[model samples]
Target: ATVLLEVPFSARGDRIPDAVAELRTREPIRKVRTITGAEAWLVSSYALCTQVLEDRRFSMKETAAAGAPRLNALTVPPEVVNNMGNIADAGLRKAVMKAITPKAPGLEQFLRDTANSLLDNLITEGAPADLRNDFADPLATALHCKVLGIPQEDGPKLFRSLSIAFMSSADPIPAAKINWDRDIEYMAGILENPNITTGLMGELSRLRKDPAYSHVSDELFATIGVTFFGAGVISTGSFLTTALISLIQRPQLRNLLHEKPELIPAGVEELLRINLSFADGLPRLATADIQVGDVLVRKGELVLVLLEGANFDPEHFPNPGSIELDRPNPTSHLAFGRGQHFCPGSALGRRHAQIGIEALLKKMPGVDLAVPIDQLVWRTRFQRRIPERLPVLW
Candidate 1:
């Protein structure tokens, strides 16, 4: 268990797309060492990762009786990962879906207005700000909190907590994330009350009362909080910030987006694909011995699929490194994940990113990096991915 995978992800914030290609081609199910000295299975193929995602053999559920295959001693335990399959109630998921579904008239406009107001406030703070703080994280979290009837003002503290808490690491992170969980737990209790007669929480509660939907319960409500905070909020913010930073770095592309506003929607998809965003979110265990290309993986093994590596695979995507505007079937990128666990908030995330990035570029011109690229810091081992600081001057 103490054996560390000598894969290319060595430095802090290192992504091993090259290593992934080598593994998928040369040794698909390769055994490797983690920084914490645990041995695990590393899966690199798009097809194999997709298979594990869709097939029950490699899976996790809130009440999954099948033992969780531990990759190493350092991996988050199955119970902690129960948040992955938290929403077991079919009725509650349905009601919550009703609130979040993109086709629900005017969802995109509501997200746009909310994001614009935050960007307006952020511009006042400074030109080069933490994209994580000034825009991305707050926009997604604030909007979700509003839909669930939580005060948007409370977003930063709670999000700051959950963000750190989700880090998959051996060394303990900051104490603030622990305190943030207590805050979120308290908030969840208030959201569950039947009198909370509005938003996603209230809709779920109302649906629970129906005899036809007898499966609904308090646990379902609890999962709603975790899922919205987990899948809906965190990764979207990270990816949104990635899109912003990408545009900022390439002003020509930024202007290109503005000149053809209609291209913004498809352009968002390409940004999510090419951008190196969320890092620690993908962790899969090999349920049984499997073959992904040439590699051999043993049963009961853990594999970390680098989202950045998979998205940029040359075989799956032509001229994979650079961004391609007309990426046919652009959603093929694994940014929102795929199969059963595909993100429920993808459309919403895209809408927020487009609105925020377009507004920032259109309103603020000649934005330049405040500090040299060498001065900026990229965060490590956190649940979501983003630059620690993106200083800019307009």
Candidate 2:
């Protein structure tokens, strides 16, 4: 059953076996009770899952539109929600890929160096510490700031603004809108500023001057900046946290990665599958009667596609619960989602997770949970999936 964030996460971890195993096998789709007391259909079958994601009838953008049926009332308007398509437009996507992805080689070298330097300071500062706070989160945050030409000092400030904007439910719309604009404005300022380094922003600016790239609009640049910054920072934090958790729990996986560090690149795919997290999947609404297994989802219902379940689906993965160190091609996880809704920054996100985890595992040697696993506190209010404080005893 679908309860609130904390309750379900804990329940799923604790009693997932006797909890809902029968429902999953008997009927792939079942009505789950919600924290808000509304009953919604939970879709599990892979075929239906694909149908729901690709089908136009299940309208995500429109439900987020002003008057549409909202499972969560504090929605950002359709215009802002449309940023998911920030890369959908071919011209815009091309412009963005050229600006960011192509620069990965240069950035990758810098990222490794940055990770080493950051780890050195982390070790020098303390012997025992929260791997989450000290190592994983900050390194990922700083790397994003470095890549985007966002100032290091302002990263925390902007992060605060984002939290106020997205996390809070006491009407995040007005304040979120203000912060969203402020964030874009700041990004635009950085893009044009000569003092900013030659990175993604400079490439975007350079593309603007080219007569050959007439289709790439000013709006695309701003949209790319907004979407990348919005999606990148928080996720890198989550992935890093997940990485730490995995390494701590499974020494076999950790030792293997450390021994053949080159495979860390390929291991990212498996790591993502194993460390699946989201507030379920991205929320979408049904415009028509969409069949989820046997259940018929009426015209307007909020649906979460459950990345957790998707990764754990036995049909898609063999030994779904266990981690395979050398799974070879382990990217079946919907952590980055799929189809048009798939995350654009999946590649960068993987790299961020890979480096952060390796460094922590190496430094700590073996990370064991400090508290009983059941007592771990995770972030609530927002869809953020993070431990409040992950204390590891090495």
Candidate 3:
């Protein structure tokens, strides 16, 4: 008799569980029960994880199909699951992608300046700062607002919606719907605002009125604004917060980066590779009988692609836990995912972390944790593995 293993292993963002490594070696592809009480294949090996992500037969959108075994309940409307695909269908993909590129003239500079200003405020207020609340999150909120062409002051209000917006739950979250509806109305208003003439929203607003895009729904335009803002802010904030923890734990590496700032990008890449920001495995519904790592996953079955499993697999990345800057396949990790549903904001994400790290290293060369590692509280049952309050000092 086999008992199904419950997933997510652990909620602590600071470290990956030893069980993950053990499972990767013993049962790379095995059955697990999700929060929704559904049985799914948890793919642990690098090869198998890559195979699942690369196969078009494994569908991200289809995971939202009614009656499909769910990895989590929907925080947004079911239609929002296929967001990127919908953008592509509306021919708005190019505009959306171009809007998020980090190379957009002053965007990098904006990030640098913003990071410095946030650090300056932290410095002025002085030590034992809650970095997650005061710095990482605020930086994410500010960046997303700028990218979306929304008022910077409006960021905090929209950001308040995310704690519910990104929940991983077994049942429907009523408050999530409430927030989603409110946020959608806010975005809808943004589209109607003649003064909203910059960033992604600006482009989206213009597209809504274009005769070519007249058939595209008002729902989609509003949904795009809400979803993008929430996703970008949550991801960038959570990743930066945890990356800070990883750096703080490794003083030698931190000092090295501080001394030689040019290596920050490589360091950020390694950080991204090892980040435990994603709390649960990426879920996809199989559309065909796909043989993956000894398991013949049948059509309509749910499959969970474990990013850390692929990332930490010693078979691909020798000495997987080490932050080796010179690894030959440095950028090959599934941090931003793979294939069709891969993250479109990856460039912006990388730049956000890199710039944030660079600024922090310069500002607080001796930054370290203010409390004991175990004392740091982790946010559970959320889309990202993050500390509720990352208390730190210089």
**TM-score of every model versus the real structure:** 0.85, 0.85, 0.99
Best by lDDT: 3
What's the lDDT for all of these models? 0.64, 0.63, 0.94
Clashing pairs in 3: none
Q: Rank the candidates by lDDT, best first.
A: 3, 1, 2
Once fitted onto the true fold, the runs of candidate 1 whose alpha carbons sit more than 4 angstroms away are 1-25, 62-90, 103-106, 171-184, 192-195, 213-215
Per-residue lDDT over 1-394 for candidate 1, one digit per residue giving the tens place of the 0 to 100 score: 6644553363223233456566667765566766455566666666666665666555544212344443222223334455435554353555666676555565567677776776667688766566667767777887677666555676676676664555656454556445545755755675555456766766766666678767655555655665576566766777776677777777888788878878888888888887666654266665677765566666666566666666766788878767679877688888887777677777777777777777766666666678876565767655655677666677
Where does candidate 3 stray beyond 4 Å? none
Candidate 2 least-lDDT 10 residues: 6-15
Candidate topping TM-score: 3
Error of 2 at 315 (Å): 2.0
What TM-score does model 2 achieve against the real structure? 0.85
lDDT of 2 at 138: 71
lDDT, candidate 2, residue 176?
A: 73
* Model 3 agreement with the true structure over 1-394: per-residue lDDT tens digits: 8768998889998778999899999999999999999999999989999999999899999999999999999887788889999999999999999999898788889999999999999999999888899999999999999999999999999999999888898899999999999999999999999999999999999999999999999999999999899999999999999999999999999999999999999999999999999999999999999999889999999999999999999999999999999999999999999999889999999999999999999999999999999999888899899889988899
Name model 2 segments beyond 4 Å from true: 1-22, 33-39, 73-77, 165-175, 207-220, 326-329
